[model samples]
Structure formats: C-alpha cells, structure tokens
Target chain A: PFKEVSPNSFLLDDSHALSQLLKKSYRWYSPVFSPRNVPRFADVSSITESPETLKAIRDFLVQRYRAMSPAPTHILGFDARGFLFGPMIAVELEIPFVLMRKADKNAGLLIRSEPYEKEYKEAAPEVMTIRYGSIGKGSRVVLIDDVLATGGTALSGLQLVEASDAVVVEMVSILSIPFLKAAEKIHSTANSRYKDIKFISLLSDDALTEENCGDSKNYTGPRVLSCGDVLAEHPH
Target chain B: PFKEVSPNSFLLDDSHALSQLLKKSYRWYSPVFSPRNVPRFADVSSITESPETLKAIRDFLVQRYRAMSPAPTHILGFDARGFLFGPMIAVELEIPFVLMRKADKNAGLLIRSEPYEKEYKEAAPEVMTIRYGSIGKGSRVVLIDDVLATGGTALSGLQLVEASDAVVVEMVSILSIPFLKAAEKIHSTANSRYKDIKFISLLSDDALTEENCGDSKNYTGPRVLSCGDVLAEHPH
Candidate 1:
C-alpha cells in the first residue's frame, strides 16, 4: 500500500488510502476558512486514530529505518503530532526517543533551542527545544513529524539536532506536501552534514489532492481531497 | 524494580530508582521558582530522554496493561508529555491509539472537547479535544500521561472518554503525586462508569521526594528530590 518514490523518499501508492479518513477535511464539517488561515491541509489525525492504519504506518517506517546502512542511535520526535508515531518507531527499533518540545522560556533543562516561523503562519514565531544532553554529541538521529508542509518545523528540528552536534541520518514525516517543496527547502538550508540524510514521507501532496479523489464521498473513497477544495467545488 | 501498591496502583520498589535520574530536578541546574509557579513538580523529561529508561518504563506499563482482565481496545494519550509513552503502550498491545489533543478552536475535525485546569495551576485553563469517531462508543480505553498531579488533566481525560461513551478501563501515569490527591478527586467526580477504573502510577510522590534522595548529589543518588527543596536546603 506504500512505496518508496526515490532513493530515500516514500509515498502511499494509493493517495486516498490515508486521506479519505479525514472527516474534518470534508466540506460538510468545516466549510469556511479565512484568507490568513491555511485554507487546505492534510490532517492525519484520522489516520493515526486507527490501530490497523497506525500499525501499518509504524511497521512500514520500522522496515524502512531498519534497512538503513548506519542505523540511527536515537529518534527525535517533534512535539505534539510527531509524538504519535515517533515513539512507536523508536520502541520497535529499540532506540532512545527524545522530544523536540515546543519552547518554554522557563523550560528548566534543555539541550538546544531553535526558533522558527510556522509554514502556514497560523501562529506567531515559536521556538523548539530538546531535553539537555539527551542526544549525545555525534549521535545519529532520525527526526520525525506527522505532516510536512512548508518544512518549517522539520528544518527547525534538523537545526536543533545540528546544535546538539548530532548528525540527522534521516528526516521522516508521515505525510508530505510536494506542492510546498518542504524537502527541497530543508535540504538547501540544513547543514552539509545532512546532505545525505534520507527523507521519507509516506503520503505525498499529489496523492492527497482532489484530482486523486475518486468516486464516492467520505472515507469509503480513495480521494484524499482537501476540505477547502471540496468546498470550492460548490461555487461558494 | 516496580511493584503494585494496591490492586490497581503500582509504584517503584526502590523509591529512588527512577527519581535520581532527574538532572534538572537538581538544584544545581535551576535554583529558583516563584510561589505561583509549580516549583517542585516531577519533570520526567530526563526519564523519557533515554532509550533504556524510556523502554523500561514503557515495558513496565505494557506489562501492567497487558495483565488487565479485559484488555483495552484503545489508548488515549493526553497531549504533549503523555504522547511520549501512550503510543508506546498502544503499539505494544496492538491497540488503536487516539490523542486527547490540546484544544484548538480552529481544530477542524474533533470528537469531544473538555475544559480543564492544570494540577499545579502553572498555566491558564486549557481545553482538550479528540478526533471525532476515533474511539467507538462503549470501547475500552486506557488514558495515559507522563505525570499526574491534582488530577486536573487526567480528570479531563476521563471526562473526555466518558463523553465519547467509552469506558476508561484504566488511567495510567508514569509518575503520581499522592500529595496532590488527584486520584480521589478523579474518582469522586468522574462518571460512575469510571468507579472501577484501575489507576497506575509507576513512581509515587514519596519516591520522588527530597527525603528519598539517598546518598550522592546527582543521578547516582536514589532520592528523586525536587529541584526546589534542594535549593531550600541552603540559605537563599
């Protein structure tokens, strides 16, 4: 159901496989969005909600990472969403998993803190922090997130690892937005040490668009169409 | 070494086994806290930072939940910190894991939203939301969090499960504050469906206190003393 697109990239063979499960993405649920808001986006909460689906994704990531030449010694999961599957993969691989927490000024103990703007600009500039001394200097790490849109968070994650003097072996996201070109932005901006870092996104933006939306409404359909696009179709 | 205190409750046998790993809890790292601030809270970040420590904790939770008379069909992890191990246990047991996400009003798709106060009152009152249809009605759920104090978040979590019409088979936290009396408040106020909910905390308040801080100054010591108490030991 999932396939590796390039040497290090992966995408769902059936774009709609995961996207159709997004109930909130449906026009009936949320019909409007402000211009400043991220009008259309893939919400993987629905996919992560199911055991069968969640396990399948976890197993796929494990299989992929387990095949690496020099496997990662640690897993760095971004706060919140990344927490869903990062530890899932870490436990399976039996590696230490550290959180890249949302920054707190009073955050007592921390290894590194990197500020970044949200890709969608939905929130003000935020800083990402990691537990102090969690990833030993020169440790190999695989940074994880649930969705990759503009690459803002992932880049910050990569930066955090760099500040810790660790090499990011791979940057993994369950979903990717090729349209937003996150992978390219991250590669160009990351330290040269990450030049060869493997990038894995299980679902791609092309696969998640309305054009991919086949017949039928709701999850029964393989169309991973965006909620905004669905509303746009109604001539609002 | 961990042992059960009561039928449904579990704690560390050594008392200082896990508490001593807290580097931030050391007065040397952070020396002050405002009265309004949660000065002496148990920060499990140090514990969750290591693979061995993380796995050990995960294994203990898995072992406990696995022994349940009726295994849970779903795992609901509280936001942020709870994310660390909630999915770890779910993956181990092969159950669906649903997130009780920190509330986002703009959050497009959601099942239930519950408002709550923090146990320590460190922050503003927050709301927790869940993905719609994630947990089926009458499904068995095990709510997980890293630390439990004053039972505020955990209580809201139990309420979220109740609103979903699911039975909270057990409420699990890696650390507990018996001093805060969270369990009593949760059981007393929660829906009757939760009267039998098995509550599990791997480490208790006493185990993480200054008195338990055995010999040695750092993690080498078994005393899981708070950062504030150590500072209090010396003159301001």
Candidate 2:
C-alpha cells in the first residue's frame, strides 16, 4: 500500500519500478556509456576525461530530460554537477531556477534532514540545503544529475524537497550502476520511509559481477540497460 | 487630417500642437517659486545624492507610474537615466520594456531619420538597435523620462519606436521645464508628423511666465512638481 506521509510525499517500491515508468513515459538518454551496458566502478578523477567532456555529458543528459519532461518542470540538480545542469536546463525551459547549496546560507527556515557526503573526497557528511520557496509548493520538479552511484546525494536532495513542503514528481540521471548496492539500500530506506517517489535512469549497468571485479576486460562494450536490468538479480 | 506616408504612419496638424496640448493639460510648477515643491530636475551627478537616494527616486517614480497605468503597457526609456527607471517600472507593472540607445549597436536594421539633440545641448544624433520580433506590430507603448527639457531625447526615443513598427500610445515624464521652447518645437514636429501620439507629464514649471522671470521677488518658494500636479491640468 502507498503511504501518504503528509500531502504529496510517498515511499515507492524499488528504484527500478520508477525507472520503468519513466522509460515507458518519457524517452531519456545516457551520455557516458551506451544505453545497453551497466557502468563500471571506475575513478572519474582522470585528466583524460576532460572537464569539457564532463560538461558535454551534463548538457546531453539535461537536454534529453528537458525534451522529455513537460513544460514548467523545474529541473533540480545536485551540488557540483547539479548546479551546472539545473540552471542550464531551467534556462532552456524558460523557467525560474534556484541552486541547492551543500552548506546553509543562513536563509529562512533551515531544514537539514537529508544526509550526504561532500563532493570533496575527504569532507565529512553534511546536510544538503534544499531551498524553500525557491521552488514553490505544488511545483512539478524533475531531479537531474550526471551519475547515480550510492544514491546518497540523490536521496539527500529528495529529503530537502520533503522538508520544504514541495513534491518531487520524478528523478532522472545519465547513468546507474546496478552493482553499487547503494541503489537498493536507498530504495529500501525510501520504501520504508517515503514510498511514492519515482526514480528513472537512461542506462543501467548490471555486469559489475565478481569475475570482472578488477579486470577492465570483464567490462563489456558500452551497453544500454533498461529498468528491467535494474529489477533483475545479479550473481554476486 | 492624418496623412498616410508609410503603411501605418501618419502626419498630424502641426508639430507644435502636441506641445500646446502638453502645456494645456499637464500641471506646471517651479521649485524656485512654489512652496513645498519637489525639485523637477534631480542632479543625479551631485555628490549630495547618494546611490540610495537615486535608487529611492527610481523606485518611487516606477511605483507611481505602475500604480497609475493600465495593464500591458510597453514603457520605452532613453539611454542612461531613462533606462534606470524604465526596466524597473516595466517589472513593477508586469509589462514589456525596451530601451533606446544613443548610438546603434550595429545589430538591427539601421533607422535613418532626422537628428535630435538632448536639452538643445548640441549632442550627437541618436540611433537605435531594436529587437525585431520582440514587440508585436501596432503594440501600444509608453515613453518615459525623468525630465523633459528640450524634448530631443524623448522625441528620438519615440522615433525609434515608430521605426520599429510600434504605436506610441503616450509619452510620460516626471518633470517638464516650461522655460524650454524645445518642447514647442518637438510638439510641432510630432503633430505635423504623427498626430495620434499623446504627450503626458507629471508636472511642468509655469515659472517661465514673463512676470516671474522679470522679477526675482515674484518667486515664492522652491519650484518642484509631482505627477499629481501635472495631471491636475487635465480634469479627466
């Protein structure tokens, strides 16, 4: 049963369930890998993956989501990458946009509930500042990002929305690594805590199996995975 | 009788007729003689006036016009000071706004017309760059300014609108000096050229009278004027 915590807040089933709905509803795309294969747990701190490339990836993902989403949809992005894509997407959509800072700016009614780690590798866990009144109540918002790894940052963003009395109608991303285990953990927590929230991804990677643990060869060509892949069980 | 030159252009009775209309309709005051009169010409360049004072004046003028004007009025302001109040008033009134530049930005189609000097100060002729599709054809526009002396800047701003295919519903100003014969010159040109345009002002200094100018003792107080005082002449 769907539990209505307050008004529009809800805890949905699995993240994959929401992903499937989005795939069937709006056509979204991934940037890093092909739509078929799942993502590998690789370090993104390389100079080879130029800043321009990352920006291009963000732009592509935002454009796909913006094109698929309806008019007047507020695209709420996360800290670093989120800030880049959120306002850009909002500009493309010609809507009012605001940034969600990691640290509190001493604004009105600070509600620090969502827990997430700082983008800086060594920083401690911090509360995400989900701005209130920036996205007014009853506004239709589409959460966007470059990647969905442990789901901590994404979860924290969602929590910020809840604290501000606004609803997150849907969540979207460029890539989703199925073996992250964090996705399922987030799903369970959200299901028990808040269930109606929906998650969507352009590509899902389930091939992060043990055999391919440390070997680059184990990772197949960039493949496209759907919501079905996210729902399937992988052999440990 | 109105003469059709361009597809939507017209020629009015006389250029000075509009000036006569303004003199007959708008209120007139002089800070040197009138008691408790607000100065028509604010020395924006003076060190005595802080940035806050300029902003206050800007805000006050914007608020007053927005409250008085009807909806969907397009406000056109001249280069520097006119720009200060123009955009703010448009935002306050929730209407579209445009600016007239002194020199063309080498972008839009060049509008070749006659020369206009500011306050008869021998300033260069004005050229404007208009956004082609921004304003609809035959749209009503309200031209605004802080002071109307020679009426050169205001006339050039109006001409820019005409060149861009917009209708001049009316011209509004915070203050007008009756001493300047340029107002008559401007009205004669506009009346003979475009008769349908309406000229409105908040207040005009009537201190240009022969009795007041001949004898300094005739001056009563500081001659200042407000929009209310200008409207007092027009009983409607």
Model 2 score (lDDT): 0.45
By summed lDDT, which 10 consecutive residues of candidate 2 chain B come out lowest?
A: B41-50
Looking at model 1, give its docking quality level. Answer: incorrect
Off by over 4 Å in 2: A1-236, B1-42, B45-70, B104-113, B116-124, B205-236
List the global CA lDDT of all models: 0.61, 0.45
DockQ of every predicted complex = 0.19, 0.01
lDDT, candidate 1, B196-221, per-residue tens: 66687666656544642322245333
- Model 1: share of native contacts present? 0.24
Q: What is the TM-score of chain B alone in each candidate?
A: 0.71, 0.54
- Tens-digit lDDT string for candidate 2 (A4-85): 3233323222243333332222222122321122234322211001233333433454455566645444666664444323
- Chain A of model 1, TM-score against the native? 0.70
Question: Between which residue pairs do clashes occur in model 1?
Answer: A96-B51, A111-A132, A213-A223, B111-B132, B212-B223, B213-B223
TM-score of chain A of each: 0.70, 0.54
What 10-residue stretch in candidate 2 chain A is worst by lDDT? A42-51
Report the lDDT tens digits of candidate 2 across residue range B1-236: 23332233232222333333323322222344222234432321110012233333345545555655454457766544454345434544555555444322211212333454444535555544333333455677877775677667766666656655567776665445645644456656734675455565543455223322211355453222222332243332
Tell me each candidate's TM-score.
0.74, 0.32
